[PDB]
């Protein structure tokens, strides 16, 4: 890894700084409200 | 919540034709939804009438309702017309229209959805 | 098509007591395209079981579907009385399909 960051192939002694460590998502969810009513909108547009 | 509202029930005359429908409150006929149309007569054992695709657009009669009636339906709205020419004595009785609740292509094999029928008479 | 009897015409038993019920047919033999049905006058039919093997939405437990051959069977475990009405077998494998006559249970 700290070849890979450094763009060398021997690394000197020290101490180097790499990528992050982080936390991946599991899973998804979604809540939108609950209705389901279907909106009047044949009545605006086919009006005569 | 999904529940089937039907027309309400009707007088006609001998030597003319019927259009029938119903609805849905929040229920839509969609791709994969189909239903079938059921009458009941007094104190008599029901009847199939027929079924309809609303995507493919394939519909299945009875052998002896091959002359009479017509099944269409129009995704969009969603709805369902029933054309059924000379009603005699014999056709006076409560049709149904039954679909189950299926969305996703993922609904069983019973029709759960029930409409209350229009009890049709032609004197 | 297949011409179904249902199986006893009449019941009366006391209520609580276990039920079974049978439909029979001729035609082309499917099991798990059957359903049961029970209809109260003046309101539409609600259905029971679907396919010979699962329950719809809010059946309770008392139904219970059974048989392996061309028979088709249910069963009843306790006869609350607001159960007193007609059943009926529907199958969809075959051609244009047909009812049966009905079993009315009473009191
Ligand atoms: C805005 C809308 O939905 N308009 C529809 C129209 O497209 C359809 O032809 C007609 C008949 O069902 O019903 C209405």
């Known amino acids: 890894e700290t070849k890979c960051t450094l763009k060398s192939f021997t690394v000197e002694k020290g101490i180097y700084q790499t990528s992050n460590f982080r936390v991946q998502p599991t899973e998804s969810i979604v809540r939108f409200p609950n209705i389901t009513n279907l909106c009047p909108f044949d009545e605006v547009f086919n009006a005569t | 919540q999904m529940q089937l509202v039907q027309s309400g029930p009707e007088v006609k005359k001998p030597g003319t034709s019927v259009k029938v429908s119903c609805k849905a409150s929040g229920f839509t006929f969609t791709d994969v939804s189909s239903l079938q149309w059921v009458r009941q007569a007094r104190g008599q054992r029901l009847e199939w009438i027929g079924w309809?695709?609303?995507?493919?657009?394939?519909?299945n009669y009875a052998p002896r309702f091959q002359e009479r009636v017509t099944i269409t339906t129009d995704k969009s709205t969603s709805t369902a017309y029933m054309e059924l020419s000379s009603l005699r004595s014999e056709d006076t009785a409560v049709y149904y229209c039954?679909?189950?609740?299926?969305?996703?292509?993922?609904?069983?094999?019973?029709?759960?959805?029930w409409g209350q029928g229009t009890k049709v008479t032609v004197s | 098509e297949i011409v179904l009897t249902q199986s006893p015409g009449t019941l009366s038993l006391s209520p609580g007591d276990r039920a079974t019920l049978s439909c029979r047919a001729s035609q082309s033999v499917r099991i798990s395209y059957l359903a049961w049905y029970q209809q109260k006058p003046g309101q539409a039919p609600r259905l029971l079981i679907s396919?010979?093997?699962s329950r719809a939405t809010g059946i309770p437990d008392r139904f219970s579907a059974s048989g392996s051959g061309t028979d088709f069977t249910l069963t009843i475990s306790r006869l609350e009385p607001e159960d007193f009405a007609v059943y009926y077998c529907?199958?969809?494998?075959?051609?244009?399909?047909?009812f049966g006559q009905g079993t009315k249970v009473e009191v």
């Open positions: 309809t695709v609303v995507g493919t657009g394939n519909t």
């Open positions: 529907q199958q969809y494998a075959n051609s244009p399909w047909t």
């Open positions: 396919g010979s093997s």
């Open positions: 039954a679909a189950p609740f299926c969305s996703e292509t993922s609904c069983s094999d019973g029709f759960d959805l």
